[PDB]
Amino acid sequence: NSTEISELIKQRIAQFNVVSEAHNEGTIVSVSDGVIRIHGLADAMQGEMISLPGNRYAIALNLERDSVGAVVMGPYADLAEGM
Amino acid sequence: MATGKIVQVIGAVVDVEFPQDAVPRVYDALEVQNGNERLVLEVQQQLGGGIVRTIAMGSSDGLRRGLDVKDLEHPIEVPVGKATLGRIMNVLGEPVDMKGEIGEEERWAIHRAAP
Amino acid sequence: TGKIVQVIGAVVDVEFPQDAVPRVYDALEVQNGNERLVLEVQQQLGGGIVRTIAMGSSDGLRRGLDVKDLEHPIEVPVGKATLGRIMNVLGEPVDMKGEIGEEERWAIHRAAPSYEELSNSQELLETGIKVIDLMAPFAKGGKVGLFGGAGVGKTVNMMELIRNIAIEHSGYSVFAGVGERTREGNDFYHEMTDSNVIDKVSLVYGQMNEPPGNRLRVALTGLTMAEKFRDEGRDVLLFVDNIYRYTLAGTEVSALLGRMPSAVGYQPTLAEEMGVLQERITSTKTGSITSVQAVYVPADDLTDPSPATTFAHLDATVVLSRQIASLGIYPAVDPLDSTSRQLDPLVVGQEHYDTARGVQSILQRYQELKDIIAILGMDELSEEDKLVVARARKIQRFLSQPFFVAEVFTGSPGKYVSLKDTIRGFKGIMEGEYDHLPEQAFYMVGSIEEAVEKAKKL
Amino acid sequence: EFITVARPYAKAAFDFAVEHQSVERWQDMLAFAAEVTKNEQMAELLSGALAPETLAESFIAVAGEQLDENGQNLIRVMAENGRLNALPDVLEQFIHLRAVSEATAEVDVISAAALSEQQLAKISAAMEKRLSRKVKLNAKIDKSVMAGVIIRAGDMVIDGSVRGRLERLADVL
Numbered sequence: 001n002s003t004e005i006s007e008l009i010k011q012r013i014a015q016f017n018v019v020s021e022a023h024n025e026g027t028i029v030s031v032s033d034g035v036i037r038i039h040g041l042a043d044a045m046q047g048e049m050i051s052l053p054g055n056r057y058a059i060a061l062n063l064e065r066d067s068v069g070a071v072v073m074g075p076y077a078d079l080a081e082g083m
Numbered sequence: 084m085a086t087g088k089i090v091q092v093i094g095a096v097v098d099v100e101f102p103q104d105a106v107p108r109v110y111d112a113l114e115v116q117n118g119n120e121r122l123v124l125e126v127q128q129q130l131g132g133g134i135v136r137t138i139a140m141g142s143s144d145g146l147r148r149g150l151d152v153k154d155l156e157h158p159i160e161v162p163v164g165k166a167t168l169g170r171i172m173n174v175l176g177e178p179v180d181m182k183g184e185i186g187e188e189e190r191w192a193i194h195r196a197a198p
Numbered sequence: 199t200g201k202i203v204q205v206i207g208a209v210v211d212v213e214f215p216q217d218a219v220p221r222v223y224d225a226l227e228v229q230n231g232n233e234r235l236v237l238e239v240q241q242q243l244g245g246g247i248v249r250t251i252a253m254g255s256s257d258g259l260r261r262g263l264d265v266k267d268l269e270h271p272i273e274v275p276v277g278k279a280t281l282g283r284i285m286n287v288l289g290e291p292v293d294m295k296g297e298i299g300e301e302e303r304w305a306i307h308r309a310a311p312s313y314e315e316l317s318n319s320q321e322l323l324e325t326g327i328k329v330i331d332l333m334a335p336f337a338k339g340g341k342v343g344l345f346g347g348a349g350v351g352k353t354v355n356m357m358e359l360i361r362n363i364a365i366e367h368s369g370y371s372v373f374a375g376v377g378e379r380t381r382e383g384n385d386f387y388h389e390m391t392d393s394n395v396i397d398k399v400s401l402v403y404g405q406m407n408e409p410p411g412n413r414l415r416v417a418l419t420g421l422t423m424a425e426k427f428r429d430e431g432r433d434v435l436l437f438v439d440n441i442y443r444y445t446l447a448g449t450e451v452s453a454l455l456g457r458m459p460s461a462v463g464y465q466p467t468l469a470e471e472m473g474v475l476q477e478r479i480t481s482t483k484t485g486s487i488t489s490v491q492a493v494y495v496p497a498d499d500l501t502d503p504s505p506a507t508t509f510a511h512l513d514a515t516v517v518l519s520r521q522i523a524s525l526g527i528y529p530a531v532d533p534l535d536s537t538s539r540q541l542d543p544l545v546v547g548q549e550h551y552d553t554a555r556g557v558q559s560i561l562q563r564y565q566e567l568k569d570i571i572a573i574l575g576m577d578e579l580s581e582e583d584k585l586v587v588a589r590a591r592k593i594q595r596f597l598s599q600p601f602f603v604a605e606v607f608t609g610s611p612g613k614y615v616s617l618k619d620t621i622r623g624f625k626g627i628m629e630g631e632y633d634h635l636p637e638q639a640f641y642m643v644g645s646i647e648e649a650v651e652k653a654k655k656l
Numbered sequence: 657e658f659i660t661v662a663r664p665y666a667k668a669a670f671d672f673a674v675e676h677q678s679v680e681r682w683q684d685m686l687a688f689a690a691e692v693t694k695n696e697q698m699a700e701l702l703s704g705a706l707a708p709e710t711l712a713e714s715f716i717a718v719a720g721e722q723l724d725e726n727g728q729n730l731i732r733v734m735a736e737n738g739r740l741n742a743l744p745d746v747l748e749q750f751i752h753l754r755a756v757s758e759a760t761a762e763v764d765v766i767s768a769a770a771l772s773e774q775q776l777a778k779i780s781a782a783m784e785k786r787l788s789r790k791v792k793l794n795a796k797i798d799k800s801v802m803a804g805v806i807i808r809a810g811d812m813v814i815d816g817s818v819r820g821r822l823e824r825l826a827d828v829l
């Protein structure tokens with residue numbers, strides 16, 4: 001009854017369209033004093049340039065288990081959660 | 084329409100929760116009805132989950148959890164120009180003398196990039 | 199088999215199947231773009247997670263990279279095959295010559311020799327430097343530490359010690375560059391090759407450009423080579439370019455390893471990390487290591503935990519003072535702080551001991567008088583206090599000496615001074631035999647005869 | 657690991673299931689709530705920064721079987737505090753509480769051979785005497801046991817093996 005419920009779960013996730021981010025893409029989780037926390041970016045690498053909305057970059061300093069910690073190469077005050 | 088609600092009040096620090104899709108940006112200005120007077124809050128940090136953390140531009144006493152919060156989408160804006168001459172104002176650009184309203188022509192945001 | 203799950207600076211976390219988790223200090227391997235990166239295991243966290251330090255640049259690492267588990271610690275070539283070659287922390291050749299003709303490789307993590315194995319020795323080892331073997335002489339098979347701040351002459355003093363000892367000495371030598379200037383390594387390499395003494399020296403270089411793991415482990419690599427030569431039964435010279443950088447590389451990674459800060463922000467394990475390294479540098483009934491170590495003193499603070507911990511581990515300690523160095527007295531040894539286990543009447547004999555303690559007493563009394571002199575000036579002193587000052591100043595000048603490696607800086611020929619000349623000269627100064635010479639006669643003269651010849655021309 | 661934060665919820669769920677005489681259903685329900693937690697896409701969502709109630713309603717959407725207003729409300733509680741990844745450890749502590757309440761113990765027996773089954777009758781009687789609980793045996797054959805048998809119950813072990821006796825005598829240097 002385990003395999004059945006496993007595939008039941010996989011059917012029901014699709015029925016509700018819950019799905020992952022694409023690799024090389026993510027969302028800003030939190031913003032403070034120019035430090036940025038990003039969820040996703042499963043293919044980001046240490047020291048990479050992450051392109052933000054607008055025409056600016058953040059530098060990936062930490063690859064945490066659940067997030068990427070990055071610092072903004074410019075003004076940060078216009079950034080927002082969910083970009 | 085107010086869209087946020089106060090969720091913590093720890094001294095001057097007020098945390099407000101908004102819908103996931105409408106978190107105010109850093110340095111934006113919020114306002115709440117502290118009883119019978121408006122209190123302005125300035126955004127310092129965007130925490131995860133739609134929560135934002137602010138510093139109260141006024142007395143924090145009397146605030147409850149669950150009060151409605153209005154998101155003014157600009158930073159703190161102050162009157163400027165010739166009308167300001169000879170007038171005393173507070174940080175919010177409100178007259179602290181008794182001499183009536185300031186005949187403003189423009190209001191500028193106080194947060195700016197240098198030339 | 200393994201998967202990378204975090205990358206924080208120099209620290210990488212790897213997950214393994216729970217039946218296969220690597221041991222502590224196992225070497226792991228991961229392909230980073232177009233190169234191979236070694237990781238050394240530091241801690242086992244729960245659930246098959248293991249926390250490691252990168253032996254190289256960690257930039258460009260993704261999460262989710264496959265990691266290979268090598269079944270052994272970091273192992274380096276040892277023996278005569280290493281002689282005359284420059285090697286990396288991983289035991290790789292760094293000179294442009296071919297592969298190292300190793301016959302054996304040793305793990306760099308080892309236990310110190312047992313209490314039963316240790317050996318005593320009192321054979322005084324002579325140096326060309328007046329102040330060192332007068333005030334803080336040292337024996338064959340002992341440890342010497344040069345303590346000093348930035349730019350006060352630790353390297354120059356160590357190079358003079360190399361020139362004199364490691365060329366009148368006949369056996370092998372190991373030089374470990376730990377977190378110091380690459381330029382100085384290249385200069386040393388060449389002047390060894392031009393002198394054709396290179397074929398007696400093994401050189402391991404972990405200089406400052408390297409990421410923290412290399413600076414952390416390179417000292418252990420050097421000790422492993424020196425231990426191979428010791429256990430063969432030889433008498434060996436080990437030179438460590440700056441021991442402080444090892445503790446500093448511990449400090450840099452300690453926070454990322456999740457360890458609460460201690461004291462001045464140092465790692466809590468500072469004393470143990472220093473002790474396990476230092477205890478392996480020991481002479482033994484089978485063979486003897488003689489060691490000279492430079493010890494950087496941050497912000498000239500001799501009460502900082504790192505110098506303070508280092509002091510207990512050494513037999514002879516020479517303390518270099520910025521205040522003396524700014525007078526231009528070189529070598530800038532402070533004789534009121536420098537000290538040796540060997541300054542003992544039984545080993546040195548009575549004349550040397552009495553001369554050293556007389557010099558120490560006069561200089562201490564001069565320190566006591568300087569605070570009076572600063573406000574009042576010397577004219578208020580007693581006529582015996584003025585004589586104490588007049589002799590102490592000459593003693594301070596006579597401790598200066600021209601070095602051959604300082605021929606390029608000073609422009610004047612270097613001097614080698616026998617111990618007998620030092621004892622005779624300082625005894626003569628303290629007895630007042632030379633009370634009629636000016637102070638300038640004593641500055642930067644090799645021997646007392648040279649002081650009188652300089653005095654004739656002032 | 658989640659054990660310490662999972663304990664309070666496990667107690668609350670077991671107590672509620674005792675009052676409403678639904679312990680078996682609750683066990684089968686927590687099994688499903690733990691199993692949905694293990695799915696890839698759901699696990700990615702759990703690591704995200706969704707506000708509690710939106711995450712709770714999406715999870716409840718996937719957890720259709722759950723008894724509405726009891727298990728789904730437990731999901732809402734755990735979603736307020738972000739403990740949903742602890743659900744595999746909120747379960748198994750529920751099972752531990754159940755086994756304690758039912759005064760029943762799983763006990764394990766490891767030997768060099770398949771035991772004679774008459775030996776198992778004696779062993780089960782002995783364990784029901786050592787511990788005042790009904791004892792379920794799930795014994796095993798293991799190559800490492802040179803001879804004899806190991807008895808393990810909870811975190812107490814009674815080594816009757818020849819291997820252990822040897823390495824216990826070899827200790828006497």
Ligand SMILES: Nc1ncnc2c1ncn2[C@@H]1O[C@H](COP(=O)(O)OP(=O)(O)OP(=O)(O)O)[C@@H](O)[C@H]1O
Nearest residue numbers: 346347348349350351352353354528529601604607
């Ligand atoms: N015996 C000496 N005679 C003349 N000058 C000297 C002597 N010793 C040192 N100096 C001067 O001090 C400078 C620095 O010397 P050195 O490189 O040995 O210092 P250090 O304390 O080991 O420094 P660092 O901490 O930067 O590695 C020399 O370049 C030289 O100018």
Ligand SMILES: [Mg+2]
Nearest residue numbers: 351352353354
């Ligand atoms: Mg130096």
